[PDB]
C-alpha atoms as a PDB file:
ATOM      1  CA  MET A   1     -10.742  35.424 -37.184  1.00  0.00           C
ATOM      2  CA  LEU A   2      -9.224  38.868 -37.888  1.00  0.00           C
ATOM      3  CA  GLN A   3      -9.720  42.646 -38.256  1.00  0.00           C
ATOM      4  CA  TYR A   4      -7.961  45.383 -40.302  1.00  0.00           C
ATOM      5  CA  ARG A   5      -7.549  49.107 -40.185  1.00  0.00           C
ATOM      6  CA  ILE A   6      -6.644  50.612 -43.596  1.00  0.00           C
ATOM      7  CA  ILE A   7      -5.745  54.187 -44.572  1.00  0.00           C
ATOM      8  CA  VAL A   8      -5.529  55.225 -48.271  1.00  0.00           C
ATOM      9  CA  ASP A   9      -4.674  58.403 -50.231  1.00  0.00           C
ATOM     10  CA  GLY A  10      -4.977  59.227 -53.956  1.00  0.00           C
ATOM     11  CA  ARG A  11      -8.157  60.107 -55.820  1.00  0.00           C
ATOM     12  CA  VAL A  12      -9.820  58.021 -53.052  1.00  0.00           C
ATOM     13  CA  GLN A  13     -13.198  59.803 -53.526  1.00  0.00           C
ATOM     14  CA  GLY A  14     -15.152  61.541 -56.350  1.00  0.00           C
ATOM     15  CA  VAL A  15     -18.795  60.607 -55.681  1.00  0.00           C
ATOM     16  CA  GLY A  16     -18.682  57.358 -53.611  1.00  0.00           C
ATOM     17  CA  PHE A  17     -15.340  55.505 -53.373  1.00  0.00           C
ATOM     18  CA  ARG A  18     -16.310  55.022 -49.703  1.00  0.00           C
ATOM     19  CA  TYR A  19     -19.528  53.357 -50.969  1.00  0.00           C
ATOM     20  CA  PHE A  20     -17.493  51.227 -53.448  1.00  0.00           C
ATOM     21  CA  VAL A  21     -15.236  49.797 -50.739  1.00  0.00           C
ATOM     22  CA  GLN A  22     -18.334  48.890 -48.656  1.00  0.00           C
ATOM     23  CA  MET A  23     -19.832  47.174 -51.753  1.00  0.00           C
ATOM     24  CA  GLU A  24     -16.611  45.106 -51.892  1.00  0.00           C
ATOM     25  CA  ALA A  25     -16.997  44.534 -48.105  1.00  0.00           C
ATOM     26  CA  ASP A  26     -20.548  43.156 -48.576  1.00  0.00           C
ATOM     27  CA  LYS A  27     -19.432  41.150 -51.655  1.00  0.00           C
ATOM     28  CA  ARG A  28     -17.061  39.216 -49.298  1.00  0.00           C
ATOM     29  CA  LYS A  29     -19.305  39.586 -46.158  1.00  0.00           C
ATOM     30  CA  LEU A  30     -16.845  41.741 -44.226  1.00  0.00           C
ATOM     31  CA  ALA A  31     -18.459  44.066 -41.633  1.00  0.00           C
ATOM     32  CA  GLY A  32     -17.004  47.427 -40.515  1.00  0.00           C
ATOM     33  CA  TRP A  33     -16.986  51.203 -41.251  1.00  0.00           C
ATOM     34  CA  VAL A  34     -15.493  53.729 -43.738  1.00  0.00           C
ATOM     35  CA  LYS A  35     -14.553  57.391 -43.008  1.00  0.00           C
ATOM     36  CA  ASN A  36     -12.777  60.378 -44.633  1.00  0.00           C
ATOM     37  CA  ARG A  37     -10.171  61.891 -42.291  1.00  0.00           C
ATOM     38  CA  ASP A  38      -9.694  65.661 -41.860  1.00  0.00           C
ATOM     39  CA  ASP A  39      -6.045  64.999 -42.906  1.00  0.00           C
ATOM     40  CA  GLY A  40      -7.439  64.051 -46.379  1.00  0.00           C
ATOM     41  CA  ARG A  41      -7.037  60.224 -46.305  1.00  0.00           C
ATOM     42  CA  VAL A  42      -9.880  57.717 -46.425  1.00  0.00           C
ATOM     43  CA  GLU A  43      -9.859  55.215 -43.525  1.00  0.00           C
ATOM     44  CA  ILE A  44     -11.562  51.814 -43.259  1.00  0.00           C
ATOM     45  CA  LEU A  45     -11.890  49.313 -40.357  1.00  0.00           C
ATOM     46  CA  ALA A  46     -13.635  45.888 -40.440  1.00  0.00           C
ATOM     47  CA  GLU A  47     -13.679  42.342 -39.021  1.00  0.00           C
ATOM     48  CA  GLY A  48     -13.512  39.205 -41.242  1.00  0.00           C
ATOM     49  CA  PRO A  49     -11.527  36.066 -42.198  1.00  0.00           C
ATOM     50  CA  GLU A  50      -7.927  36.640 -43.393  1.00  0.00           C
ATOM     51  CA  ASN A  51      -8.595  35.792 -47.075  1.00  0.00           C
ATOM     52  CA  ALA A  52     -11.638  38.103 -47.191  1.00  0.00           C
ATOM     53  CA  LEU A  53      -9.746  40.978 -45.531  1.00  0.00           C
ATOM     54  CA  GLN A  54      -6.715  40.573 -47.841  1.00  0.00           C
ATOM     55  CA  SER A  55      -8.848  40.271 -51.018  1.00  0.00           C
ATOM     56  CA  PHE A  56     -10.541  43.514 -49.898  1.00  0.00           C
ATOM     57  CA  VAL A  57      -7.078  45.147 -49.393  1.00  0.00           C
ATOM     58  CA  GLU A  58      -6.302  44.221 -53.046  1.00  0.00           C
ATOM     59  CA  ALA A  59      -9.703  45.649 -54.160  1.00  0.00           C
ATOM     60  CA  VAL A  60      -8.878  49.020 -52.503  1.00  0.00           C
ATOM     61  CA  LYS A  61      -5.157  49.039 -53.496  1.00  0.00           C
ATOM     62  CA  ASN A  62      -5.828  48.201 -57.178  1.00  0.00           C
ATOM     63  CA  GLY A  63      -8.034  51.328 -57.446  1.00  0.00           C
ATOM     64  CA  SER A  64     -10.472  49.380 -59.664  1.00  0.00           C
ATOM     65  CA  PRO A  65     -12.978  52.381 -59.876  1.00  0.00           C
ATOM     66  CA  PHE A  66     -12.488  55.826 -61.466  1.00  0.00           C
ATOM     67  CA  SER A  67     -11.298  56.696 -57.922  1.00  0.00           C
ATOM     68  CA  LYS A  68      -7.828  55.140 -57.321  1.00  0.00           C
ATOM     69  CA  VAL A  69      -5.236  54.862 -54.552  1.00  0.00           C
ATOM     70  CA  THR A  70      -1.625  56.117 -54.854  1.00  0.00           C
ATOM     71  CA  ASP A  71      -0.563  55.325 -51.212  1.00  0.00           C
ATOM     72  CA  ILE A  72      -1.897  52.736 -48.698  1.00  0.00           C
ATOM     73  CA  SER A  73      -1.149  51.603 -45.126  1.00  0.00           C
ATOM     74  CA  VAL A  74      -2.713  48.587 -43.350  1.00  0.00           C
ATOM     75  CA  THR A  75      -2.684  47.299 -39.748  1.00  0.00           C
ATOM     76  CA  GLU A  76      -4.246  43.960 -38.662  1.00  0.00           C
ATOM     77  CA  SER A  77      -5.581  42.505 -35.389  1.00  0.00           C
ATOM     78  CA  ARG A  78      -7.677  39.609 -33.939  1.00  0.00           C
ATOM     79  CA  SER A  79     -10.053  42.101 -32.198  1.00  0.00           C
ATOM     80  CA  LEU A  80     -13.487  41.075 -33.569  1.00  0.00           C
ATOM     81  CA  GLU A  81     -16.229  43.627 -32.842  1.00  0.00           C
ATOM     82  CA  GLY A  82     -19.511  41.741 -33.349  1.00  0.00           C
ATOM     83  CA  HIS A  83     -20.088  43.969 -36.430  1.00  0.00           C
ATOM     84  CA  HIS A  84     -22.919  42.617 -38.677  1.00  0.00           C
ATOM     85  CA  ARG A  85     -23.217  45.441 -41.306  1.00  0.00           C
ATOM     86  CA  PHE A  86     -21.103  47.926 -43.245  1.00  0.00           C
ATOM     87  CA  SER A  87     -21.285  51.577 -42.101  1.00  0.00           C
ATOM     88  CA  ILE A  88     -20.359  54.943 -43.637  1.00  0.00           C
ATOM     89  CA  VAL A  89     -19.347  57.947 -41.520  1.00  0.00           C
ATOM     90  CA  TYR A  90     -20.929  61.140 -42.971  1.00  0.00           C
ATOM     91  CA  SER A  91     -17.421  62.717 -43.229  1.00  0.00           C
END
């Protein structure tokens, strides 16, 4: 099994884009956290199977909400965490 870290920029907020991505996390039973960086990006990190993690990357990258991405970066690992929920930093 796998993990990602993702960073995104664009209109990547508005009222709850960070909530939206964690809905899409739960929808594919990923488990991890979401944050808004002081540098202005949103950042996401979660464990899951490869197909779930990549389908989630498409869900962020597509900018399906009113909030949408215009730049994305992704890193991937095998470093499972034992995460069993989604979490939202109060950034």
